Amino acid sequence: AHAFWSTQPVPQTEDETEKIVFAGPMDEPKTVADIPEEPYPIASTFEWWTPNMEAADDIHAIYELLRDNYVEDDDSMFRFNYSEEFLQWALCPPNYIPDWHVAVRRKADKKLLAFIAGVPVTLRMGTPKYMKVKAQEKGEGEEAAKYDEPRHICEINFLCVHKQLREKRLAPILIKEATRRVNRTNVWQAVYTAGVLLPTPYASGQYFHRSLNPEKLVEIRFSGIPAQYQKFQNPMAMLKRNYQLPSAPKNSGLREMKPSDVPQVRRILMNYLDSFDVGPVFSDAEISHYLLPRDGVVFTYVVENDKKVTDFFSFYRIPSTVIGNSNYNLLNAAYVHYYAATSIPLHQLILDLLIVAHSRGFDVCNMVEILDNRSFVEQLKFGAGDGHLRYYFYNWAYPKIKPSQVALVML
C-alpha cells in the first residue's frame, strides 16, 4: 500500500510499533563513505537547487511556492502564508547547514517546483519514562539507557510540491535526496510532523484554537455562531462578550524579553523541557535565535520580579490566506511557542499571552496538545480543532508516547 514508505527505515505498522521497547536506530549502521557523492538521478527537465538563504530572491522564490502551494485546511478555505522574514528565521538557526535545504527547479525558466527543508536540532530521544519503568521490572535498564544522550539530528519541515506536479512521485525523490545530504554530514535520524497519517507515528495530538476577534472569524467562516447561541436574542454580542480580554497583562513584572535575559530563559526553559520524553536542547545562541523578539515573527515576554526572570512565554505569527472571502484577505494567527512557569499557574501565564496577542491584533491563538497545553484549554476557552498532528522519526525505533510527553514545537 506504500510503494515509497515501505522501502524506508521506519516502523511499518502499529503492531510493529507496539512491540518496540527501547529507543534506537532501525537501519544498518552506515558511514559517510558509503553514501553516493552525487545527487540522486532526476528527470532532464528538472535540476536540483540549493537555495542561498542570505539571498532575498532565493527567500522570495520559496515564499511564493509556499504561499501558493503549502498546507490548506480540509475544506480549502485557508492556506498558510509564511512570511519571508519568518522563513529566514525558521530555515536559518545557529549552525544551520545550507545543503540541507533541497529544492527542485524547472531548468528552462528556473521556476521553483518543489522544496524540503532540514535544520539541525539537538534532541533528547532516549527510551521514554514509562518504558524505562517496565525495563527495570524486566531487569533491562542498561539497554533502555543506551541512547539517552541528546542527539544532533535533522528536523524536516516545509515539504511542498507545486500543485501542477502533484501525484507524480516527486515527494519521494525530494525525501531521498534530503536523506542523502543529511547522511553525507553523518546524521542518521530525522524528526518531522505531518497532519496526515503515514507509517508510523510515535505520538499524535489534537489542535486547539482560542478566538481573539470572533467577529472576523465568523465573517471569514473560520468559526460559526454555535447552535446554542440561537436561543439568544443577539448571538454575536454574546460571542464577543464571551471572548473578551483585559487590555493589559495581569502579571506586573511582565515585559518583552531582551538579550540580557537569554541565560535565565535558557535555564528555566531547559529545566522545564527536561520533564518530557522527547524535547530539544537549546544553546544560549539557540535561545537567542528562537525566542528574542523579532518584529512580525516571534513575540516573547518574561515575568521579572526582584531582578530575576521567573516565567516566560513566546508565540509566533503566521498569517493564512483566506481563499474564498470578499471582505478579508488574511487570518492573523498567533501560535503558542515555548514557555515556562515557575511563579504562577500556567493558566495565569497563558492568559497574559492571549491578552498580548489580542492587543497586538491577532485574530486567534492556536496550539497542539503538546507540552502542558491541556492544563489550560478549558479555563482559557480553547476549543479542539479538526484532525490530528502526528509526530514521526526517520530511522528511530520508539515506543508510542502521549503528546503530553512531547516538547518539540514544529514551526
Ligand X SMILES: CCCCCCCCCCCCCC(=O)SCCNC(=O)CCNC(=O)[C@H](O)C(C)(C)COP(=O)(O)OP(=O)(O)OC[C@H]1O[C@@H](n2cnc3c(N)ncnc32)[C@H](O)[C@@H]1OP(=O)(O)O
Tell me the C-alpha distance between 254 and 260, whole Å. Answer: 15
Question: What does 179 bind: Mg ion, ligand A6K, ligand X, none (CB cut-off 5 to 8 Å by kind)?
Answer: ligand X
| Contact in structure between 125 and 189 (CB atoms under 8 Å) | yes
Candidates 21, 53, 71, 330: give the one binding ligand X (CB under 6 A): 71
Site string for Mg ion, 102-141 (x = CB under 5 A): ----------------------------------------
Within 297-336, the residues that bind ligand A6K by CB under 6 A are 318, 335
Q: Does 33 bind ligand X (CB under 6 A)?
A: no
Bridging pattern class, strands 308-322 and 78-80:
antiparallel
Amino acid at 154: C
CB of 370 to ligand A6K, least distance (A): 9
**Which of 66, 355, 367, 371: binder of ligand A6K (CB under 6 A)?**
367
170 in contact with Mg ion (CB under 5 A): yes
CA–CA dist 243, 382 (Å, integer): 10
Alpha carbon separation from 320 to 227, 328, 334 (Å, rounded): 26, 11, 11
Least separation in angstroms between residue 121's CB and ligand X is: 12
Task: Based on the residue annotation, tell me whether 411 is a catalytic residue of this protein.
Answer: yes
The phi and psi torsions of 24 (rounded to 5 degrees) equal 170, 175
- Of 382-401, binders to ligand X (CB under 6 A) are 394-395
171 or 270: CB nearest Mg ion: 171
Is 96 among the residues that bind ligand X (CB under 6 A)? no
171 labelled ligand-binding: yes
**Closest alpha carbon to 117 in 81, 76, 88, 149:** 88
- Nearest alpha-carbon partner for 125 in 143, 149, 142: 149
CA 308/CA 253 separation, integer angstroms: 10
Least distance to ligand A6K, CB of residue 341, Å: 20
Calculated CA dihedral for residues 58, 63, 64, 67, nearest 10 degrees = 170
366 or 405: CB nearest ligand A6K: 366
Residues in contact with ligand A6K by CB under 6 A are 71, 157, 192-195, 207, 209, 318, 335, 366-368, 385, 389, 410-411
